[PDB]
Design an enzyme around this catalytic site. Structure first.
Site, PDB file in Angstrom:
ATOM      1  N   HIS A  72       8.895   3.526  11.052  1.00 31.67           N
ATOM      2  CA  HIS A  72       9.509   2.197  11.035  1.00 31.67           C
ATOM      3  C   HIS A  72      10.723   2.189  11.962  1.00 31.67           C
ATOM      4  O   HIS A  72      11.607   3.042  11.825  1.00 31.67           O
ATOM      5  CB  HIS A  72       9.917   1.793   9.600  1.00 31.67           C
ATOM      6  CG  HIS A  72      10.388   0.374   9.473  1.00 31.67           C
ATOM      7  ND1 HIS A  72       9.599  -0.707   9.804  1.00 31.67           N
ATOM      8  CD2 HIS A  72      11.566  -0.140   9.043  1.00 31.67           C
ATOM      9  CE1 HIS A  72      10.271  -1.826   9.591  1.00 31.67           C
ATOM     10  NE2 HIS A  72      11.468  -1.509   9.126  1.00 31.67           N
TER      11      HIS A  72
ATOM     12  N   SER B 185      13.002  -4.542  13.194  1.00 32.82           N
ATOM     13  CA  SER B 185      12.633  -4.922  11.819  1.00 32.82           C
ATOM     14  C   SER B 185      12.932  -6.407  11.617  1.00 32.82           C
ATOM     15  O   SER B 185      12.336  -7.234  12.329  1.00 32.82           O
ATOM     16  CB  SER B 185      13.315  -3.948  10.854  1.00 32.82           C
ATOM     17  OG  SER B 185      12.929  -4.217   9.516  1.00 32.82           O
TER      18      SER B 185
ATOM     19  N   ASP C 225       2.997   0.681   9.799  1.00 31.13           N
ATOM     20  CA  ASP C 225       4.425   0.476   9.596  1.00 31.13           C
ATOM     21  C   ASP C 225       4.803   0.706   8.133  1.00 31.13           C
ATOM     22  O   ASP C 225       4.117   0.223   7.226  1.00 31.13           O
ATOM     23  CB  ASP C 225       4.804  -0.939  10.030  1.00 31.13           C
ATOM     24  CG  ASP C 225       6.285  -1.208   9.911  1.00 31.13           C
ATOM     25  OD1 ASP C 225       7.012  -0.986  10.902  1.00 31.13           O
ATOM     26  OD2 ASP C 225       6.721  -1.649   8.831  1.00 31.13           O
TER      27      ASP C 225
HETATM   28  N1  LIG Z   1      11.591  -5.918   6.343  1.00 29.65           N
HETATM   29  N2  LIG Z   1      10.689  -7.018   6.516  1.00 29.65           N
HETATM   30  C1  LIG Z   1      11.161  -8.289   7.072  1.00 29.65           C
HETATM   31  O1  LIG Z   1      12.294  -8.409   7.387  1.00 29.65           O
HETATM   32  C2  LIG Z   1      10.175  -9.469   7.269  1.00 29.65           C
HETATM   33  C3  LIG Z   1      10.278 -10.273   8.381  1.00 29.65           C
HETATM   34  C4  LIG Z   1       9.388 -11.340   8.572  1.00 29.65           C
HETATM   35  C5  LIG Z   1       8.389 -11.592   7.647  1.00 29.65           C
HETATM   36  C6  LIG Z   1       8.287 -10.790   6.542  1.00 29.65           C
HETATM   37  C7  LIG Z   1       9.182  -9.715   6.339  1.00 29.65           C
HETATM   38  O2  LIG Z   1       9.072  -8.879   5.196  1.00 29.65           O
HETATM   39  C8  LIG Z   1       8.463  -9.473   4.085  1.00 29.65           C
HETATM   40  C9  LIG Z   1       6.913  -9.264   4.206  1.00 29.65           C
HETATM   41  C10 LIG Z   1       6.408  -8.144   4.968  1.00 29.65           C
HETATM   42  C11 LIG Z   1       5.046  -7.951   5.101  1.00 29.65           C
HETATM   43  C12 LIG Z   1       4.132  -8.880   4.469  1.00 29.65           C
HETATM   44  C13 LIG Z   1       4.618  -9.956   3.745  1.00 29.65           C
HETATM   45  C14 LIG Z   1       6.042 -10.157   3.615  1.00 29.65           C
END
Ligand SMILES: NNC(=O)c1ccccc1OCc1ccccc1
Ligand SMILES: *[C@@H]1O[C@H](CO)[C@@H](O)[C@H](O)[C@H]1NC(C)=O
Length: 341
Positions: free
Chosen positions: A287, A145, A243
């Site tokens: 996930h 993640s 996901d």
């Molecule tokens: N749990 N998700 C994270 O840690 C994550 C890690 C890198 C980039 C974004 C992340 O989530 C925010 C997000 C997810 C999907 C689309 C837009 C923004």
């Protein structure tokens, strides 16, 4: 059980200034080292981080950490649970920086919190070289993640760090689980939190990606399909096509509009993996996987994830009946019968 070591350099800290650290279980008959990055979202301003400190404090502080953890999945030392690397040296690095492992900012009179994820990884590597890492043949930097994204942001820096310290023989590789789209939401920006966060964390991204997107646009390098093409280290990508964290940010929780939305999401994710030679992408709603105890159960085209990682090892010495690129083509959650329940 892996046993806790707090960092000897107490200036490398979790969000609240307590020392960061790692859990270690050595295997003296092995020259393979697995360093696993924990996940758990992030926080991007003072108020949002204050809320995280009340109810997710283990992800911002080491003061309440236990002295041991049980290794599970790819961190298990039992051949039955971990067919891939059961005999490796195992390291679990807790996520206590809330910065997707990108930060390089200390607590000070103008910063309520420290965001030191990128520096935590380097200091863990530095201190492990005195406990056996100096003799390694392979260092696999893995994560799930937010820790999966952290592999993508840090694997080439770890490679560079070992080169400059005088260790050219250690092959550095990456395994990114559930950290791979900045798409349109199903219902109504999440990317803005990342933009604002990098600026709050003094976050750092890989140099080649930084140079492509340039100042103000480094948030792009948090997205797998944009940062992966700039990396030199070999990286294996594990990603469920549907996901659950991706769907959550897309505001999906079935009529024709949603059916088309979900099918297009799988199509787009499959398209971004077309030119990723080492990858495992089942058509499931789920996930994370690599530290779950039943991670051996899922298969794509008859090949399990532990097998695909073994075939990847062989390729880095196509192989006959031992594939490395495994991406479902069927277009709906759980059209793969081996999906988790
Ligand atoms: N749990 N998700 C994270 O840690 C994550 C890690 C890198 C980039 C974004 C992340 O989530 C925010 C997000 C997810 C999907 C689309 C837009 C923004
Ligand atoms: C401790 O870590 C800090 C922050 O990365 C760094 O400035 C310093 O060089 C380190 N100290 C030692 C003795 O390595």
């Amino acid at each position: 059980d892996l046993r806790l070591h707090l960092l000897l350099n107490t200036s490398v800290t979790c969000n609240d200034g307590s020392p960061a650290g790692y859990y270690l279980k050595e295997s003296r008959g092995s020259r393979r080292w697995l360093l696993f990055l924990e996940g758990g979202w992030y926080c991007f301003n003072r108020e949002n981080c204050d809320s995280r400190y009340d109810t997710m404090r283990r992800l911002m502080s080491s003061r309440d950490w236990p002295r041991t953890r049980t290794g599970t999945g790819i961190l298990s030392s039992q051949p039955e649970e971990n067919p891939y690397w059961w005999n490796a040296n195992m390291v679990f690095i807790p996520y206590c920086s809330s910065d997707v492992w990108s930060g390089a900012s200390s607590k000070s009179e103008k910063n309520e919190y420290a965001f030191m994820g990128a520096l935590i990884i380097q200091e863990v590597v530095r201190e492990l070289l005195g406990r056996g890492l100096s003799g390694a043949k392979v260092l696999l930097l893995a994560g799930s993640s937010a820790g999966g994204t952290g592999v993508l942001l840090n694997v080439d820096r770890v490679a560079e760090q070992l080169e400059k310290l005088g260790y050219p023989a250690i092959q550095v590789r990456g395994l990114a689980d559930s950290g791979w789209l900045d798409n349109k939401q199903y219902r109504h920006a999440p990317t803005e939190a990342i933009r604002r966060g990098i600026r709050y964390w003094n976050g750092v991204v890989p140099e080649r990606c930084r140079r492509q997107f340039q100042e103000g646009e480094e948030w792009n390098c948090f997205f797998g399909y944009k940062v992966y093409p700039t990396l030199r280290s070999p990286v294996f990508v594990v990603q469920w096509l549907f996901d659950e964290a991706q769907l959550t940010v897309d505001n999906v929780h079935v009529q024709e509009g949603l059916r088309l939305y979900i099918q297009n999401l799988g199509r787009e994710l499959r398209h971004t993996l077309k030119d990723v030679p080492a990858s495992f992408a089942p058509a499931c709603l789920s996930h994370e996987i690599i530290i779950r105890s039943h991670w051996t159960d899922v298969q794509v085209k008859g090949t399990s994830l532990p097998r695909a990682l073994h075939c990847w090892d062989r390729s880095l010495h196509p192989l006959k009946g031992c594939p490395v690129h495994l991406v479902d083509s069927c277009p709906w959650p759980h059209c793969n019968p081996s999906c988790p329940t």
